[PDB]
Design a protein around this ligand. Structure first.
Ligand SMILES: OC[C@H]1O[C@H](O[C@H]2[C@@H](O)[C@H](O)[C@@H](CO)O[C@@H]2O)[C@@H](O)[C@@H](O)[C@@H]1O
Ligand SMILES: OC[C@H]1O[C@H](O[C@H]2[C@@H](O)[C@H](O)[C@@H](CO)O[C@@H]2O)[C@@H](O)[C@@H](O)[C@@H]1O
Lengths: 100, 100
């Protein structure tokens, strides 16, 4: 992961991370990644190893340079605040965001 | 700058998914899909960017023209109204793949 070490100007909109990432040989590339493919809402907590969190979470934002923050529903249908460190698994490879 | 439709053909919408066949940077074609539920919200019956999960409260999605998502979305008063959003605002063709 550790995309924040290779990328700047990051943003979250919905479930999409956008960032400007350095290419292997010099310049930069504007990249995006749909985190809904790799993050699950498990009883109100954002977790890796699943998908589809955006269906039951709201108010997604980037906190700091690499944390996704949101408000997600528990199984009992109550919203709680939750965060996950995207640097755990999101990398930049030759300027493109990828899940590792 | 979005504008995928300038490089893409045979686009279709099914549920929240856009699929299109786009010309690659150096030639040939690639087909890819994009889950618009990641980045479009239903705000009181109107589709808007800067949110997510419109599909939960919208139905009858289709492609209008070459780049417009048309749908019927529920207002706060719980009635379906027609709405459209131009996917060229934010969806681009990047070397033949749809990206935000
Ligand atoms: O329904 C979509 C939802 O399914 C899964 O989440 C379950 C649970 O962990 C959630 O707390 C509640 C919230 O209503 O929904 C499900 O029971 C996950 O796959 C989740 O990512 C997804 O949004
Ligand atoms: O419930 C899912 C729904 O939540 C949000 O939409 C709200 C509002 O704008 C809609 O008009 C009504 C329709 O019932 O629902 C909510 O109150 C948005 O996140 C929307 O994308 C989503 O489908």
């Amino acid at each position: 992961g550790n995309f924040s070490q290779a990328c700047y100007n990051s943003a979250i909109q919905g479930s999409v991370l956008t960032s400007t990432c350095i290419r292997t040989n010099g310049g930069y590339n504007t990249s995006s990644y749909d985190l809904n493919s790799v993050i699950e809402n498990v009883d109100g907590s954002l977790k890796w190893q699943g998908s589809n969190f955006i269906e039951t979470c709201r108010n997604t934002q980037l906190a700091g340079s690499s944390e996704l923050a949101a408000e997600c529903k528990t199984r009992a249908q109550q919203f709680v605040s939750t965060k996950i460190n995207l640097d755990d698994h999101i990398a930049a490879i030759d300027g493109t965001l990828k899940y590792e």
